[PDB]
């Protein structure tokens, strides 16, 4: 671990310039899908920020990140961080993001080894984790699905950010 990056990175973009949207909540399971949000645009590289706000128990979080070659030429230099998600996340230490094991952050958290019979890892498209029934103190951690370095003609991909703001719930 011990990898270091920042929200803005090389995009040279401010938080006010982000295009912020909330997760498509689907009953117990909240979802942040970047399938169509990161394709190279002419006005790129934009920044898409998906905000997941869990204020209730036993919420499953699912994050979709398109893969190298799912479509041709449009996700070639795609990178997802942390590479060992969801078991590793990103926290705000100082103003620079650092890697942390998610089980240390939240206790009782349950990560299924497989998702639809394939590994629970961004390398297979999607990651999932089920928050426990009790969270004692507010926690925030981030994921990254960044296609900003992918260039097609004059277009450039976007950088995807997943903010997971968990508030205290339970006794």
């Amino acid at each position, epitope marked *: 671990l011990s990898y270091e990056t920042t929200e803005s990175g090389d995009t040279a973009v401010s938080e006010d310039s982000y295009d912020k949207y909330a997760s498509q909540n689907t009953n117990k399971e909240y979802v942040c899908d970047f399938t169509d949000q990161l394709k190279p645009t002419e006005s790129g590289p934009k920044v898409k920020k998906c905000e997941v706000k869990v204020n209730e128990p036993l919420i499953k979080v699912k994050i979709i990140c398109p*893969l*190298k*070659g799912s479509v*041709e*030429k*449009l996700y*070639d230099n795609i990178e997802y961080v942390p590479k060992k998600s969801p078991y590793v996340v990103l926290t705000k230490e100082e103003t620079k993001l650092k890697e942390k094991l998610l089980s240390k952050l939240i206790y009782g958290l349950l990560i299924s080894p497989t998702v639809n019979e394939k590994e629970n890892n961004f*390398k297979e*498209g999607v990651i999932e984790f089920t928050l426990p029934p009790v969270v004692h103190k507010a926690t925030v951690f981030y994921f990254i699905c960044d296609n900003s370095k992918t260039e097609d003609d004059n277009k450039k991909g976007n950088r995807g950010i997943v903010e997971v703001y968990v508030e205290p719930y339970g006794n």
Partner: single-chain antibody
Amino acid sequence: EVQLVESGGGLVKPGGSLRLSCAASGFNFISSYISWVRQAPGKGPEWVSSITSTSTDIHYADSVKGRFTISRDNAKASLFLQMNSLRVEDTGVYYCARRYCRGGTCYLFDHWGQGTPVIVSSGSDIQMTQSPSSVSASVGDRVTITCRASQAISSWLAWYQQKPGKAPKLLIYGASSLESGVPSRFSGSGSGTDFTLTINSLQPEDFATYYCQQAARFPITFGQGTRLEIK
């Protein structure tokens, strides 16, 4: 029972036209990514064209751009390649092969059709090199095939087996990972630009041609293959 069947092959003269069709059965065609892949005489496979399931994003190879047109019909689980302004270099077997994601990439092919031949006659990119060109070897020996890329591709390299008369079949992905069912004698190794395939003990069924393929960046690319012959 995944099945892809090609049709439309024939003989045409330079400048002529032809139309290929691929019939699919045994899987969800609406969620599948299917490409056309041709193999000319004495050459390894060459990606030609692909189309997303929604038909929104289409891509062609440079050699066939402006002369070929791809299309699909989800309801009838069919894929069409309309070939116009055909040239002698367009001669070869034309496959339709499904795309699947293995490891990190989806620049890999799961199932191939039998291939419909196309005869055209009247009388920048990653170059993959391979070595040797052919080996003949006894049962129980050790053979090592090499594959060199013209650009860095990390471990995004696959190996395909093509037994005489049949389509290729993926054996290794990620340079060193074995697909389901591949025997243990098959070994993969390498990273960056130089890669290697090794069969520790040659059994009679290993008789075939082995192609390497970079799954790193568009466009997909194969090597010229290495023929392996068991004596």
